[PDB]
């Protein structure tokens, strides 16, 4: 054929069962700070509902503070998704997931205070250099594979994988952030959500769907990291969607045949054939030839030398992040949307 690998599979099972017990304690039994405890330094990222800011604890430690304007979080699914994000982040623990330190609310806003990861988004490094070599892309992809193996074992789907949401830490490793689309799903779920270039076809077609959409999105991510652009690429979301549902992927001539084979099996419209979704689950991905050089345990243990280490001048350095327009926070004299956000 193509001994340790099977003991390795028992060890995975053992790790995941222990991980599930820790998660469930925090999930069952989830206001740990206040706004005045922090100085606001710079906006690091923005979105339709607020911004993420670099802040400094008035302890000196730096954090990434996500500020959600309750009056912008107005649609039903936008509200549910915010409660999902807080409850999931306070309950998970894994080396490649950002750590939530504090959460609290006031009359106008919700706040989630996370560890500050100063290396920047993978997005800007990838767009600056064009595309990553296959060994470079593989190193990052391996961390995502392990992260999804962890999340899916807790019945969590992530649902917004893309370089914008992957931060590089001081060792060159990835930290997944932005859990706004993440959800506990034991069977299927039905919300039409995510980022157009990364949606699996079943989302677009309004079919109930499951964790296999994360594995499709991993195919999009690996392709984009190795090519510099994603496989379904068009000016307007409706055009992107048409391309996805045909699923007629063309690959750059420099992609290895091992890479193309993995991607054809991840970008598989037929769910009875999509890797990650079959009887052997994640192991069809982990044991694929494109990953034959990958030491999964050494990646988990952070023993592998990273492709590059971002440059940093000190704590609170923001040089690896782009600039955004700043807008002062205004806390209203009156409480807003207190009912919608009672569990936060």
């Amino acid at each position: 054929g193509h001994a340790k690998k099977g003991s390795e599979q028992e060890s995975v099972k053992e790790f995941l069962a222990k991980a599930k017990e820790e998660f469930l304690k925090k999930w069952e039994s989830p206001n740990t700070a206040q706004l005045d405890h922090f100085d606001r330094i710079k906006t690091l990222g923005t979105g339709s509902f607020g911004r993420v800011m670099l802040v400094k604890h008035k302890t000196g430690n730096h954090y990434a503070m996500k500020i959600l304007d309750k009056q912008k979080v107005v649609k039903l699914k936008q509200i549910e998704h915010t409660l999902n994000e807080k409850r999931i982040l306070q309950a998970v623990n894994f080396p490649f997931l950002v750590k939530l330190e504090f959460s609290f609310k006031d009359n106008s806003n919700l706040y989630m205070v996370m560890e500050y990861v100063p290396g920047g988004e993978m997005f800007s490094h990838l767009r600056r250099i064009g595309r990553f070599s296959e060994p470079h892309a593989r190193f990052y992809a391996a961390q995502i594979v392990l992260t999804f193996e962890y999340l899916h074992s807790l019945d969590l789907i992530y649902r917004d994988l893309k370089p914008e949401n992957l931060l590089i830490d001081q060792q060159g490793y990835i930290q997944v952030t932005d859990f706004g689309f993440a959800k506990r799903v034991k069977g299927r779920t039905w919300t039409l959500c995510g980022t157009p270039e990364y949606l699996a076809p079943e989302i677009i077609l309004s079919k109930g769907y499951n964790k296999a959409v994360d594995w499709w999105a991993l195919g999009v991510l690996i392709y984009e990291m190795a090519a510099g652009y994603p496989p379904f690429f068009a000016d307007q979301p409706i055009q992107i969607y048409e391309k996805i549902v045909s699923g007629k992927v063309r690959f750059p001539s420099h992609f290895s045949s091992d890479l193309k084979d993995l991607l054809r099996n991840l970008l598989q419209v037929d769910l009875t054939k999509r890797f990650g979704n079959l009887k052997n689950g994640v192991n069809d991905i982990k044991n694929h030839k494109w990953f034959a050089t990958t030491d999964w345990i050494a990646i988990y243990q952070r023993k592998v030398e990273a492709p590059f280490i971002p440059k940093f001048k000190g704590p609170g350095d923001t040089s690896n992040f782009d600039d955004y327009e700043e807008e002062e926070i205004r806390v209203s004299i009156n409480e807003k949307c207190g009912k919608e956000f009672t569990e936060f």
Binding site: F181, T191, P196
Partner: peptide, 13 residues
């Protein structure tokens, strides 16, 4: 010919 800048996720398409 596609989107090269940061991409907004949609919470309910």
């Amino acid at each position: 010919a596609g989107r090269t800048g940061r991409r907004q996720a949609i919470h309910d398409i």
